[PDB]
């Protein structure tokens, strides 16, 4: 109907439907068990995570996945493992990440040939995260993954202890 | 008005495309072309074009092998590759793939070659009932994605004659994709 839905199946066409069967195995390799992926509905997506948060710090990189895809050869899909910190100590790790589309949107907002404004940004991204969520709850290759929606000015927010605060209620 | 939304969803995914792949790598495209011919490609009717070259297949029919897809394409090597740190995921990479294009047994031609990847998405958003579009939506949002991207790339500063579309219709296997390429490439020589 609209750009978030390209949007959110391109997202797990191309993205996650490829690594999240391949995930658990991928940290087997390397030693939580699920993608945790974030979904700012302001699609303010910075590329180091430690700029929004100082007490999200990159710890190291997953093993990398590779495939063939469109014709270039070995294409390559990273991910990036996170510790969490509290009172300078940490308090968890996991892969933690952005959704990408979410800086479509915020780019497109921003060239005028996009004809898109901030209100239609806004929207779009919301659509992006229900499309995105209804694909997942009927994907078969999705408990891998973990969506973290939420709307940001705000020294109230801690983006840290907000991944933490999922991190402990998974954990029982 | 099901118009409407075939035009959201391919204007969407070209600006994807320019916004999360193209601008990102046509800047330096040109400088990781002359690097490969200076140091590592001294064929003198063998060098590499200087443009990246991308497939457009009209009903998103879109392998993953490319050099499968006709025998007298062949796989020949990579470009240097170029890393960026990319919504919190530390280097992600970003790899293209060099093709030599064969025609009666000589090399014809030598490219930066692949497939748009979105179209991947529209064939799948064809597919998937949850999507809910028809095989006549997806042509329909292919040729709108093919005229939204010409659209960004002609106003688009990272684009100076870096990157050429190579639109086509492809049914029986009588065509020749890289006689297809070919073509274009000859025509810029
Ligand atoms: N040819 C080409 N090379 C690229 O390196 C590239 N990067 C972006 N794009 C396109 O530009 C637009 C905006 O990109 P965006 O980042 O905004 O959204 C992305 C993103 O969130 C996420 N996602 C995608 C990639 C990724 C990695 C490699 C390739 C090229 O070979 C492939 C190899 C093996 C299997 C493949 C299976 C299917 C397709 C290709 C395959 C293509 C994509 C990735 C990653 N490595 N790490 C973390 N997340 C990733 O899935 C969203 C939609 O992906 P999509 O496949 O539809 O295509 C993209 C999008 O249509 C690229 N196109």
Redesign the interface.
Known sequence: ???????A??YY??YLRLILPELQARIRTYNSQRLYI?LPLDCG?????SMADPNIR?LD?LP?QT??????????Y???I?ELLENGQRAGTCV??????L??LF??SQ?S??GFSREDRLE?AKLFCRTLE??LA?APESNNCRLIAYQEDDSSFSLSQEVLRHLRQEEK
Do not use: C
């Open positions: 109907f609209n750009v978030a839905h390209g949007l199946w391109s066409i191309g974030l997506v910075p590329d180091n995570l990159f990189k990398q495939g063939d895809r469109a014709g270039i050869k070995d294409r390559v990273s991910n990036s996170y933690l990440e952005y959704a990408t589309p800086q479509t780019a497109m060239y040939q996009a779009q209804d694909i009927d």
